[PDB]
Each structure stands twice: as C-alpha cells, then as structure tokens.
Amino acid sequence: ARNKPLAKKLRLAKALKQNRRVPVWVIVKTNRRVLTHPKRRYWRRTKLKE
Amino acid sequence: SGTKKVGSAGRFGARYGLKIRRRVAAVEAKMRQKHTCPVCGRKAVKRISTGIWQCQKCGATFAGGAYLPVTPAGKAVRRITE
Amino acid sequence: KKKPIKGQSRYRAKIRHEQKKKGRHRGPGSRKGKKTARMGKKELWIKTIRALRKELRKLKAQKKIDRKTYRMLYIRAKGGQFKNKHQLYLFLEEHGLLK
C-alpha cells in the first residue's frame, strides 16, 4: 500500500474519478430520468475489483 | 568431577536408560582427552568436527575416526603400508 | 498556554533510601527474591578474586613478600582458601611471611 506500482495507481485513480454523483444539470436535462449510475462506490462497503 | 558413575552423562539426569548413559559417558570420556599429535608428538590434539582433529600447539589438522584420532583399521593399514 | 508538567516527587523514596543505608527496611520479612538472586555468585567470586590478586601484586611491588611466597599465595587464592583479604592478612601474620 505504501509502495505502489504506477499502473495500479493509475487504475485506482480512474476508479476514484469514476466515483461521483450525477450532475444536477444532467438530471434537469433528463427530467428526473437519470438519477444515478452503476459505478457509485463506498470505500468501506463496496470494494474495488482489483 | 565428583560423580560416582554417570560421568559426562550426568547432564541427562534420570533419562534415556542405564546402557545408553554408560555408552555415552564412556565414548565422551575417551574422546574429550588429549591425544598425542602425529607431528609434534605432544598431547594437544582436540576434535574439531566429526572425523577432523587439530593440535592446539603446532596447529596440525588431520582426519581420523568419528570419536578417536586413530581406529583399528587405520592402525592396521598404516602398519601395512609403513 | 502549555501547562507545566506535574512531576512525580521522590521525597519518600529518598527518605527510605537513607533509612535503608542506616540499616532499616532490610530484615528477613522484607525480602522476596532468593539470597543468591540478591547477591549473585559469579560476580561475588570475581570481586573477591580480583581484590585478592590486586592486594598480592601490591605486596609484591612493595617487596613485603618474596616471589616464592607470592606464587604460593596466588595459588592459594585461586584455590579459594581466603574469603577476603582480611583472612589473607591473618594468614600472612600467622605464618610470618610478611617482612
């Protein structure tokens, strides 16, 4: 964990950037149709694939 | 150094049996003595490893028996070869 | 602010140490370890033998004893005849080996 390879670090970075909420303007544009995406994650409950 | 019978096998206490203790004591008593050096002729030979002996005065190192510097077969072959 | 540390005082310990130096708090009812645990064996022998060797060398240097007597007393000290240099001096006085 202290010592990390660059490729694994980049994959973790991609997952971290993925984990965020749907934009409010996206919700407004879709008219309350798109409220969430299947990539939401909680670091202590749902773990990463790697 | 003051034991009637156990000798070197006194470290075992009351274990391993009379015959085994006697054999260990006899072998160790014969081994841990000082033996005559084949080179300098003085009693300064000590066992370094199994079958390896070294003199403490002149530093001569030679190969011998497991527990004695010379075995009967070694003595016989040395006598034959002269 | 940084509050000052409330250090632990050693006044009672100092008082008890003074009383023990005088001779108090030292009876058989205040000991928990073995006698050899309290005053070990190899260290006691080392102190005794080193004191004896130092005394013998000092006497030889002052020439109060000869070389043969020094050798004999060295052998006796190694053998453990003398438990202290008071006994060593008692032996010297008794046998008249001091000049």
């Binding site: 694994k8 994959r11 694939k49 790697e50 | - | -």
Partner: protein
C-alpha cells in the same frame, strides 16, 4: 478454528491479479499465468467448449 479466525489471515499477497492480456483479475502472480485466458502459459487463448463465459462476453449463447 477453520472459520472466522481463519479468514483473518487473508492479508498476504493475493493469489490473482489483473491480467495484461484479457483484462480480468485472474493472473496467478506466484506461478505466472492467467487462469482465464492462459496468458504466460500459451500463445493461444484458453477457450473450452464446456465454458460459457467467452460466449457471455459477446452475448452469443
């Protein structure tokens, strides 16, 4: 033993890591091959007709 206390010793090196060829986390790191596509053990892909995973990948079953 054999249960909850046993499961606490999973803090060592993982058995399988990500594979550079197929992209799945199935590469046997100690041995040096992939348990899914056979990377590091064969030039050709590991396909078995009793397996439906490669068909599931492209919805061809």
């Amino acid at each position: 033993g054999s249960g909850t206390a046993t499961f606490g010793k999973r803090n060592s090196t993982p058995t399988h890591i990500r594979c550079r060829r197929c992209g799945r986390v199935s590469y046997n790191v100690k041995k040096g091959y992939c348990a899914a596509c056979g990377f590091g053990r064969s030039r050709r892909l590991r396909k078995y007709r009793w397996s439906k995973k490669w068909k599931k990948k492209k919805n061809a079953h």
